[PDB]
């Protein structure tokens, strides 16, 4: 009984710490607030898998739902193969945040597409400086890894839409709403 509760409570501790991180990313809180929410929601499983596999690779050197956990452990091993930088994690994290959208599209697809492109360019630039042994190779791998991140979580998004709150919506809109200062509008001066 106790196990599945704690992971849904750690999931919650982090989902609030993701918001705080995303809200410094350039041009995020400059998106529509509808979209901020949608983009964090849709990404979350891609985002978590990466983050978990990362802390595997960093903390216990890729040592520590076994159908489903096996994937993450497998990626954390890939991280050692690539000797992934932090830079490459934080960028690839952002990219995952922007890799899952609704088929409908977002409020401002135009704004979103610039942001994603902006970041995809950061990666491009960032691997004409940290490859191994040319740049184009490093790019092919980091990209294909981000893709396989979707495949890992491919069939487990419906199975989340169950577990998928009033918590985060508080912290996202928190800083953006702009609450003495009030200007009332009169019909006669």
CA-based end-to-end distance of the chain: 66
Q: Which of 79, 99, 119, 152 touches its own copies (CB under 8 A)? A: 99
172 close to 19: Cβ distance less than 8 angstroms: yes
Q: Does 166 bind its own copies (CB under 8 A)?
A: yes
Q: Does 176 bind ligand E6R (CB under 6 A)?
A: no
Cβ proximity to ligand E6R, 49 vs 142, nearer residue: 49
**Residue 109 beta carbon to ligand E6R: minimum distance, rounded to whole angstroms:** 25
171 close to 19: Cβ distance less than 8 angstroms: yes
Determine how many CB atoms are found less than 10 A away from the CB of residue 136. 9
What radius of gyration do the chain's Cα atoms show?
Answer: 19
Q: After which residues is the chain broken (C to N over 2.5 A)?
A: 64, 132, 164, 179
**Residue 51 beta carbon to ligand E6R: minimum distance, rounded to whole angstroms:** 3
Which does residue 17 bind out of ligand E6R, its own copies, none, counting CB within 5 to 8 angstroms by kind?
Answer: ligand E6R
Task: Using the rule CB under 8 A, give the single segment among 16-24, 60-68, 69-77, 92-100 that binds its own copies.
Answer: 92-100
Determine how many CB atoms are found less than 10 A away from the CB of residue 111. 14
Summarize as ranges the residues that interact with ligand E6R (CB under 6 A). Answer: 7-8, 10-11, 14, 17-18, 47-48, 51-52, 65, 160, 163
């Amino acid at each position: 009984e106790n196990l599945l509760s704690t992971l849904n409570r750690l999931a919650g501790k982090q989902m609030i710490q993701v918001v705080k991180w995303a809200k410094v990313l350039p041009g995020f809180k400059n998106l529509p607030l509808e979209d901020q929410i949608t983009l964090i929601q849709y990404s979350w499983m891609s985002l978590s898998s990466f983050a978990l596999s990362w802390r595997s690779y960093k903390h216990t050197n890729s040592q520590f739902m076994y159908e489903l956990c096996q994937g993450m452990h497998q990626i954390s091993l890939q991280f050692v193969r690539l000797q992934l930088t932090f830079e490459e994690y934080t960028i690839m994290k952002v990219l995952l945040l922007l890799s899952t959208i609704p088929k409908d599209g977002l409020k401002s697809q135009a704004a979103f597409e610039e942001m994603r492109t902006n970041y995809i360019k950061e990666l491009r630039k960032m691997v004409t400086k940290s490859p191994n042994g040319q740049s184009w190779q490093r790019f092919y791998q980091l990209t294909k890894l981000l893709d396989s991140m979707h495949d890992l979580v491919s069939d487990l998004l419906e199975f989340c839409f169950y577990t998928f709150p009033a918590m985060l919506v508080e912290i996202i809109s928190d800083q953006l709403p702009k609450v003495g200062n009030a200007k009332p509008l009169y019909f006669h001066r």
